Symmetry: C3
Subunit: 318 residues, 3 copies
Amino acid sequence: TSEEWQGLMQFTLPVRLCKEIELFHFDIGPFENMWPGIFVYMVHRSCGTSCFELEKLCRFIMSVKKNYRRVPYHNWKHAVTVAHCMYAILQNNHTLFTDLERKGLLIACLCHDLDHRGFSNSYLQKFDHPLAALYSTSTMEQHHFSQTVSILQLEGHNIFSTLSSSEYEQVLEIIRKAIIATDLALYFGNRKQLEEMYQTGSLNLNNQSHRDRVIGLMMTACDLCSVTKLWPVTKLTANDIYAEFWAEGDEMKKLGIQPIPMMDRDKKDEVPQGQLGFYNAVAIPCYTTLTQILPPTEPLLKACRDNLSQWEKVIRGE
Amino acid sequence: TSEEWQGLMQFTLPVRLCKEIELFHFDIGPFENMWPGIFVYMVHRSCGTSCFELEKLCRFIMSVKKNYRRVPYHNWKHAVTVAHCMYAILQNNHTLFTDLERKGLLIACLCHDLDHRGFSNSYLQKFDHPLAALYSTSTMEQHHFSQTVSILQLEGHNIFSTLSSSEYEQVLEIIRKAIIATDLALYFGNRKQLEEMYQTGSLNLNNQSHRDRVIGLMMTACDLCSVTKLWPVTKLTANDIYAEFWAEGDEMKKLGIQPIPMMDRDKKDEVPQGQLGFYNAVAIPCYTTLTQILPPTEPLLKACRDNLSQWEKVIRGE
Amino acid sequence: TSEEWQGLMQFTLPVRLCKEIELFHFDIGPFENMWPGIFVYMVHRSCGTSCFELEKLCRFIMSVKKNYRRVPYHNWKHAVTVAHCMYAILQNNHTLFTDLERKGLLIACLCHDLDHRGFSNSYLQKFDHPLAALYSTSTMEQHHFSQTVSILQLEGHNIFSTLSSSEYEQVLEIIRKAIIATDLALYFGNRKQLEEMYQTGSLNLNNQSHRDRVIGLMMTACDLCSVTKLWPVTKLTANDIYAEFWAEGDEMKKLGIQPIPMMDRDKKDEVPQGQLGFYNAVAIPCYTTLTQILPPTEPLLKACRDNLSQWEKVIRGE
Ligand SMILES: COc1nc2cccnc2n1-c1ccc(Nc2ccc(C)cn2)cc1
Ligand SMILES: COc1nc2cccnc2n1-c1ccc(Nc2ccc(C)cn2)cc1
Ligand SMILES: COc1nc2cccnc2n1-c1ccc(Nc2ccc(C)cn2)cc1
Ligand SMILES: [Zn+2]
Ligand SMILES: [Zn+2]
Ligand SMILES: [Zn+2]
Ligand SMILES: [Zn+2]
Ligand SMILES: [Zn+2]
Ligand SMILES: [Zn+2]
């Protein structure tokens, strides 16, 4: 049968990629057309070669790709990159997660920024964009999940068609919560709750609501994994992020609103200090808490620390 | 019937946009896919919800969009922007214009730069482009009108199919004259004639040839409305204009011809003085004469004056 | 018949282009949609109006165009530019080449960089790209020829369908050798052999292997013809080349490899000296040897010399 032929199959990347894709700080490279295969490979090692029907999976992937836009940062490359970080987390904590969670989170990551225009929730609200009237909170993130559901509903795109209805609902819910958790405004409270549950020892992965929070922190960690690459990758990626933000700052000014320094290209010279603030207030606490909860994710924190040092070095003029 | 269903319909933008689209200095925003709806809205308020069949109008709009190119300034966004300025002029002088003129000028504005390559008539002539052999004067502008007619002639694209033949010819002529008037080389003589007719009192909107001239000056004013936005929008848009011109300067140099300072990127430092020259010699006289003729268009002149002050401030180093 | 109608036909460019396209330093201009006609014109003057069936030729051209990518330098414009330099070489040495060679080399030039991603053979090897496993030497160049063959094999795309099988094989071999010769790593040995054969007088165009070498040097000369344009064109084109190389340098750094100064954007200030090195070590010897062998190609060498002077002038700060 078809599932039988698919069971005999092997999927394989070039040698260097098979070796280094297991590393947390792996970079997926500049060859766009290699990215779908990289993702299929990760799905097959982490989930199994029979979790998805291959023809369907590829059809789904190319449609997701088609629904990312050509913006400097929140693009198709970002999606696959975030998916890779989740792959590495899953592979290094491989006894903790169910099959549904594995399938779900990899898919959630690939879809997490679908149809991103390169603008924040804040700008949409101030512009008075139609999405802001429809989604009062987590505006873009609820749109990404809506986009995800639209793609699944396309003919020949339901990659979960083999699941029972009960499992289907579960996986879609895993996906929904995970995408919503990528709204950074929700991170601060989430990490705060996790830290306190961790310290007192109430934190228990057998409790669904705790488990949801931990997955949420995982999504933040993957979403921000730019700060966990080696310095040359981290510093170049920063160019892409500010290209987007500065464009939003321009648009704020066009609405007659002074944008914050983060989004203001007139404040370029103060980027290094702005990054330092970001690492101190957001990234280091993020990966510190995640390392506490999932000790094998420690390389993310180490790498984050190294980049913090590099930015300090920039500030000094060193 | 269909026209009856269309008569019950309402079209509406978000709240902020409904309010501020009436302002002369409105910016249509960075969300491209909102622009067609903005244009339909303007057509419905200024012309009426029964002037066009909606399905046809949208088909026409998307084809026009498809025939603008991806250049930094003379693009789809410019077209809708010029259309908005005409909307605001029409709404604030609402007793003067016929239905045909209203329909026509909004359509003319949307189509005024169709298939623009980002090069002036001058460069085409020097390059010896095939369009220059076909159109000895107003080369690009006669091409834009030809493009307009080709799109109308497409199946299901004749948005004026409900007009009588006599009215159809009239509207196409209104459109033709209006697009040709956007050739800035023709502006100088036109404004000169209008000024003198205005001063002596011979100017009379009941005279078709005077009326054509006034519409022509209206088209110039809309075409240049960049200089009538608030400073943050005006100054950022200037980036886009020079990106185009400097590219043309590069191409002049490749033909072995020294380009004028306007088109020469080696003269960046002298942009502020170049703008000052432009406002003094072209923009201020343009909106001054237009305000004389159509007093409600005065906010364009005020805004132009404010930007003139801003450029003086740049020159001073202030 | 159809070939008879095609025989009555004339193809013609605007006046300026008919005159200046015969010049070695001709620039094909910024109007993309003029480029196919320019190429057809060159084929018709150099080969004859009956060498190709026009409908087929155009179909082929647009498919080739479709298979070039949107990179800063190794793009569709580069392909037509390299084809033009071969045109000028062929027209000024018009008694030396067969019909097959003329057809072949113009086609080879148009296809020489098909599907170029903007990365060197070196980077592919270090990235461990699948093409590097398939093609151990001249990696990109064997890919360009493979792409060429795929396009020919498309229905209605075999522009050589009128040739006998024997002639078809010959032309494809001419094309294959010519594209492989564009691998610059092979140039150094090739020019070295040609120089020595030239000096001793063993060089003989009636010897197929010598003839192949001379064609190979011709391909290098066309491939590098950027350095043979007038200074304004040469200096602007240099921008495009470094945009590509610096991007590759970035990607080297992401692999953890320090790129050479040629590919490193941190070494911008040293570009003028880097060009000087390039002209001394590669370009001047290239066109010097070619001028020895084919004296009518002397204007390429003159122009190269003038650009060498310009770069020296840049270095001096003059
Ligand atoms: C969500 O915001 C961010 N995501 C990032 C991923 C990688 C690197 N940076 C990221 N940022 C980001 C966070 C904070 C800032 N802050 C500032 C503040 C002032 C100035 C002048 C610059 N940056 C910027 C980016
Ligand atoms: C039609 O030309 C222009 N349209 C504009 C719209 C907005 C802003 N500027 C516009 N320009 C324009 C007009 C004149 C100049 N002149 C110069 C001259 C010298 C230099 C160094 C720079 N600009 C430029 C743009
Ligand atoms: C194949 O390499 C090149 N092709 C060119 C075509 C036109 C102009 N330049 C070309 N180059 C090229 C050759 C050598 C260099 N070398 C360096 C070395 C150091 C530095 C700092 C800059 N350039 C660059 C381009
Ligand atoms: Zn997001
Ligand atoms: Zn994201
Ligand atoms: Zn125009
Ligand atoms: Zn215009
Ligand atoms: Zn090549
Ligand atoms: Zn090449």
